[PDB]
């Protein structure tokens, strides 16, 4: 929103809002251009976005069309889950129920990764994503 | 009573402490609002202005 | 960076050296005064290529002194550092504000404020090293440095590097 776009310059619209407002994927915080240029030039620390402690990393930012914080994170989580599993047991033989059961397991693991669960099945899915990455190398 | 009726309730005239504030009759609407620091006052007075139609033309370069 | 460029210079010769073999005397002053030096416009001078096809051109005499003026075109390799340049090297001298790293012929200091915060100065050790959370930076260790800025003074080129960002520090 216009009332919150930067922890230092939240309402720069009266002072001509000519810069963008980057959002870090490990922070999900509205950080403007001018303040963040001082940030990653002097080391990778955390942002003080309402007293945040998540360490911001240098570069690897993104422009957003504002899908809140959930659907902005769920779109990259579904895109990261669609590349590791790829089209395994889906259209390899014109399968339908076996393709739907394999896509329901990919959707429920993505729903478990989106909700966070309790970092147990997600850590098991992190091993399964490591299993989906090791099976794509052999 | 002027000191207790601050913020545009008794805009007097603090002439001098030796004059014991030779008061006057005035009242604004907000009056006080003294949270402006004096560092903000000096920077408000250190600005020179391009007069006439220059500052409207520079406002279009600035945004207004 | 190590670059090759055809350059030129003017030589002043003493009149006693005015014999038929003075072209060798021209080659005498060329090697000892150009190679192994530095210039602010070209960098640290390295080696001169082509010892045979060297432009001797002609020779003019200045009105005073009786000496002779020339202009000799050639081909040589120089080393010119730049900004934003990622290099390597080895530490030689250290400090309580960082250390200096020898990069070929040029020694570049890195400030402590251009280092990560977990990197800590070890003072009581001999030599006084720099210990972080995983590495101990001493003298003979090899450290991959990105050059930030440079000083382009004539015949005395200096620079400033850092190892704060990612894929940096020791090699
Ligand atoms: Zn700001
Ligand atoms: Zn954050």
Swiss-Prot record, chain A:
Highest taxon, organism lineage: Eukaryota
Disulfide bonds: none
Positions annotated as zinc finger (RING-type): 6-53
Location within or outside the cell: Nucleus
Role this protein plays: Acts as a component of the general transcription and DNA repair factor IIH (TFIIH or factor B), which is essential for both basal and activated transcription, and is involved in nucleotide excision repair (NER) of damaged DNA. TFIIH has CTD kinase and DNA-dependent ATPase activity, and is essential for polymerase II transcription in vitro.
General remark: Present with 3050 molecules/cell in log phase SD medium.
Assembly with partners or alone: Component of the transcription factor IIH (TFIIH) holo but not the TFIIH core complex. Component of a complex consisting of KIN28, CCL1 and TFB3; the KIN28-CCL1 dimer is known as the TFIIK complex.
UniProt protein name: RNA polymerase II transcription factor B subunit 3
Organism: Saccharomyces cerevisiae (strain ATCC 204508 / S288c)
Residues of the full protein shown: 8 to 145 of 321
Swiss-Prot record, chain B:
Superkingdom of origin: Eukaryota
Cellular localisation: Nucleus
Coiled-coil annotated spans: none
UniProt similarity note: Belongs to the TFIIE beta subunit family.
Function description: Recruits TFIIH to the initiation complex and stimulates the RNA polymerase II C-terminal domain kinase and DNA-dependent ATPase activities of TFIIH. Both TFIIH and TFIIE are required for promoter clearance by RNA polymerase.
Oligomer and partners: TFIIE is a tetramer of two alpha (TFA1) and two beta (TFA2) subunits.
Note: Present with 1150 molecules/cell in log phase SD medium.
Official protein name in the record: Transcription initiation factor IIE subunit beta
Top-level taxonomy: Eukaryota, Fungi, Dikarya, Ascomycota, Saccharomycotina
Gene: TFA2
Swiss-Prot record, chain C:
GO-annotated cellular components: cytoplasm; nucleus; P-body; RNA polymerase II, core complex; RPB4-RPB7 complex
Predominant cellular place of this UniProt entry's protein: nucleus
Annotated Gene3D superfamilies: Nucleic acid-binding proteins, RNA polymerase Rpb7-like, N-terminal domain
Protein's cellular compartments: Nucleus; Cytoplasm; Cytoplasm, P-body
Domain of life (superkingdom): Eukaryota
Function: DNA-dependent RNA polymerase catalyzes the transcription of DNA into RNA using the four ribonucleoside triphosphates as substrates. Component of RNA polymerase II which synthesizes mRNA precursors and many functional non-coding RNAs. Pol II is the central component of the basal RNA polymerase II transcription machinery. It is composed of mobile elements that move relative to each other. RPB7 is part of a subcomplex with RPB4 that binds to a pocket formed by RPB1, RPB2 and RPB6 at the base of the clamp element.
Protein name: DNA-directed RNA polymerase II subunit RPB7
Organism: Saccharomyces cerevisiae (strain ATCC 204508 / S288c) (Baker's yeast)
Gene: RPB7
């Amino acid at each position: 929103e216009n009332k919150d776009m930067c922890p230092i310059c939240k309402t720069d619209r009266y002072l001509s809002p000519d810069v963008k407002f980057l959002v870090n994927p490990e922070c999900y915080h509205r950080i403007c251009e001018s303040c963040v240029d001082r940030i990653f030039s002097l080391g990778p620390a955390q942002c003080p976005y309402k007293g945040c402690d998540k360490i911001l990393r240098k570069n690897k930012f993104k422009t957003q069309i504002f899908d809140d914080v959930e659907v902005e994170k769920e779109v990259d989580i579904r895109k990261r889950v669609f590349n590791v599993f790829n089209k395994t047991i889906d259209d390899f033989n014109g399968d339908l129920v076996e393709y739907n059961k394999y896509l329901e397991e990919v959707e429920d693991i993505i729903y478990k990764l989106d909700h966070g669960i309790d970092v147990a099945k997600t850590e098991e899915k992190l091993r399964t994503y490591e299993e989906l990455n090791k099976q794509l190398i052999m | 009573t002027i000191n207790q009726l601050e913020e545009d309730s008794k805009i007097l005239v603090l002439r001098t402490k030796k004059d014991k504030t030779p008061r006057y009759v005035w009242y604004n609407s907000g009056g006080n609002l003294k949270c402006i620091d004096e560092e903000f006052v000096k920077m408000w007075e250190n600005v020179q202005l391009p007069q006439f139609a220059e500052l409207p033309r520079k406002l279009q370069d600035l945004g207004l | 960076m190590f670059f090759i460029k055809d350059l030129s210079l003017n030589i002043t010769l003493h009149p006693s050296f005015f014999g038929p073999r003075m072209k060798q005397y021209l080659k005498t002053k060329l090697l000892e005064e150009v190679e192994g030096s530095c210039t602010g416009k070209f960098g640290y001078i390295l080696c001169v290529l082509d010892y045979d096809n060297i432009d001797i051109q002609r020779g003019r005499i200045l009105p005073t002194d009786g000496s002779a003026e020339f202009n000799v075109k050639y081909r040589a390799v120089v080393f010119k550092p730049f900004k934003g340049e990622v290099v390597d090297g080895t530490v030689v001298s250290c400090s309580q504000h960082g250390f200096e790293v020898q990069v070929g012929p040029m020694k570049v200091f890195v400030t402590k404020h251009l280092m990560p915060q977990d990197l800590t100065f070890n003072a009581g050790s001999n030599p006084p090293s720099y210990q972080s959370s995983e590495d101990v930076i001493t003298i003979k260790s090899r450290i991959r440095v990105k050059i930030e800025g440079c000083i382009s003074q004539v015949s005395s080129i200096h620079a400033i590097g850092s190892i704060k960002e990612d894929y940096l520090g020791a090699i």
